[PDB]
Design a protein around this ligand. Structure first.
Ligand SMILES: Cc1ccc2c(c1)nc(/C=C/c1cccc3cccnc13)n2-c1cccc(OCCCN2CCN(C)CC2)c1
Ligand SMILES: [Mg+2]
Ligand SMILES: [Zn+2]
Length: 312
């Protein structure tokens, strides 16, 4: 029945705004991803049957966590659509499709716990995956649903193209590890500064993609102020859960994860925009200037968080 889905006509335009909120369209979200794949990769880019199977199974394999759920895969999926539709002769076909898949899958089977939590308490996952722990998992989940029968959508294409869309997908998933993002954005800055970028350089494109993935991952902060505010509530409800179990293991969680410090959430929202969010969308704009609305909205929300703190 995901093949019988057709997107309402009035939405066709609204989806194309960077600021678009998928929030109120929960039933349509998988067809919303179908729509987006068929507009930037074309219908008949996959066999329909296996593309609807691969989608609902990925939904099945996202947990009922507060933030890193199905809603977030699709939201990031959207942001990637928006960036590729505003940059379309820059990215090949195997990037445009790999990256729409990568986004939809980038947090597969999140358990709402941070890399550090896993690493701090000897989780089985940080035993297999020692650094960038959840992302090595999210990419292991992704392959696992691809290799199910009736699920390999890249199967009908060359194995040299098939390993490329594997290795594009891997990187973008790992890139959503915000700890690596800092080095990536500072390295991109110099190459811009020194005029040493080269989009012919396959290792430079890899960085630029990773920037895009971080922007897409963080794009909750690029909505209209009512949308952004209500997503904060989801974000901390998960951080707070990871705080909670640290308070059962005797340890005082970091303020970000401390429900009992609620009055400082506005303060850290400003510190987060200024230390991560503005830097990210600033470099991504210097690099892809059609994606300046991501930058402008992030600034708009910064103003609002400013207005919360001041009580203005
Ligand atoms: C009371 C309080 C205090 C601090 C809070 C805080 C609340 N909320 C945040 C950040 C909310 C956040 C985190 C991640 C993704 C979002 C997307 C949208 C909105 N928010 C968020 N932070 C915050 C903001 C800025 C900096 C900060 O730095 C801590 C160091 C973390 N760095 C380095 C280590 N890597 C793993 C993560 C980034 C923490
Ligand atoms: Mg992640
Ligand atoms: Zn994510």
């Amino acid at each position: 029945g995901l093949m019988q889905f057709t997107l309402p006509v009035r939405l066709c335009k609204e989806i194309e705004l960077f600021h678009f909120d998928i929030g109120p369209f929960e039933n349509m979200w998988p067809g919303i991803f179908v729509y987006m794949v068929h507009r930037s990769c074309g219908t008949s880019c996959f066999e329909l049957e296996k593309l609807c199977r691969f989608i609902m199974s990925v939904k099945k394999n996202y947990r009922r966590v507060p933030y890193h759920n199905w809603k977030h895969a699709v939201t990031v999926a959207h942001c990637m659509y928006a960036i590729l539709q505003n940059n379309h002769t820059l990215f090949t076909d195997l990037e445009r499709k790999g990256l729409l898949i990568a986004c939809l899958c980038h947090d597969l089977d999140h358990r709402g716990f941070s890399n550090s939590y896993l690493q701090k308490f000897d989780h089985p996952l940080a035993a297999l995956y020692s650094t960038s722990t959840m992302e090595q998992h999210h990419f292991s989940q992704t392959v696992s649903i691809l290799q199910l029968e009736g699920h390999n959508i890249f199967s009908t294409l060359s194995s040299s193209e098939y390993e490329q869309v594997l290795e594009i997908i891997r990187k973008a998933i790992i890139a959503t590890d915000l700890a690596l993002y800092f080095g990536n954005r500072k390295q991109l800055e110099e190459m811009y500064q020194t005029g040493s970028l080269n989009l012919n350089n396959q290792s430079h494109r890899d960085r630029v993609i990773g920037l895009m993935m971080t922007a897409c991952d963080l794009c909750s902060v690029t909505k209209l102020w009512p949308v952004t505010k209500l997503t904060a509530n989801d974000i901390y409800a998960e951080f707070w859960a990871e705080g909670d179990e640290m308070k059962k293991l005797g340890i005082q969680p970091i303020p970000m994860m401390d429900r009992d410090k609620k009055d400082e959430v506005p303060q850290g929202q400003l510190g987060f925009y200024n230390a991560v969010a503005i830097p990210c969308y600033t470099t991504l704009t210097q690099i892809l200037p059609p994606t300046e609305p991501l930058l402008k909205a992030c600034r708009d929300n910064l103003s609002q968080w400013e207005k919360v703190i001041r009580g203005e």
